[PDB]
Design a protein around this ligand. Structure first.
Ligand code: MMJ
Ligand code: MMJ
Ligand code: CL
Ligand code: CL
Lengths: 133, 132
């Protein structure tokens, strides 16, 4: 299941963060998004699918997935819709929050640490899994 | 060499796009950024370095690289400062009419560029990096 991702939302400081986890490796892509809307969700899914070979995304199936825009983007990219990362990830953002003005910066520092931490990191694992394929 | 990227800027519709190319594979990460400033450049470099093992970035060494923020982000991430780009605007040209917003058209263009195929740029970067 090299192509399988899980997408969840998490909230901090009145802002919305989408976190996509590659299930088999635990590698994450996460970004603060303007609002939890289908348009912004579709944008995030298109970004992810351009960077890794995404076949299926497990989502929470809420409001921002019911609309025409998200359905059209998943169709176009060839994606089918069919834990406590949020916790660990918030924990690391908690550790780094004071070093960046903006939450978004702190989010990308937390992604870096999560993906690089090692006897393989999540980044080494996703590449190995996909290379094997 | 697996860890080597090139970062360039390109402009379209009064907005700024940064494009990072993994030199050995031609794989691209690109996005529209709010302004070509040290703060936004630093943000884009940290994003990239969190997602791939980035050792060296070749940049154009202009104004948005001389400041304290960018130097500190490259330090923190362990990055040193030491072709596809017209292709990219071409694809964006091909898809512009299908998304309202430029940002959307950019990510569609990245997808097509990275998946287009013996191997795509996406298959090549994973193969190269997995080899080590
Ligand atoms: C599979 N072995 C090579 C890799 S891949 C890697 C990495 C990839 C993505 C994010 C973070 C680290 N670091 C190393 C040392
Ligand atoms: C190395 N072989 C497995 C891959 S990797 C891949 C891909 C990775 C990133 C962006 C686009 C495609 N497609 C496939 C079929
Ligand atoms: Cl969500
Ligand atoms: Cl630049």
């Amino acid at each position: 299941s090299p192509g399988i991702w899980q997408l969840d939302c998490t909230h901090l400081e009145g802002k919305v963060i989408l976190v996509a986890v590659h299930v088999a490796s635990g590698y994450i892509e996460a970004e603060v998004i303007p609002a939890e809307t289908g348009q912004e969700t579709a944008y995030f899914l298109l970004k992810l699918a351009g960077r890794w070979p995404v076949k299926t995304v497990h989502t929470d199936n809420g409001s921002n997935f019911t609309g025409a825009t998200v359905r059209a983007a998943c169709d176009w990219a060839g994606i089918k819709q069919e834990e406590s990362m949020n916790k660990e990830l918030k924990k690391i953002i908690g550790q780094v929050r004071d070093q960046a003005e903006h939450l978004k910066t702190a989010v990308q520092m937390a992604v870096f640490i999560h993906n690089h931490k090692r006897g393989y990191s999540a980044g080494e694992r996703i590449v190995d899994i996909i290379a094997t394929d």
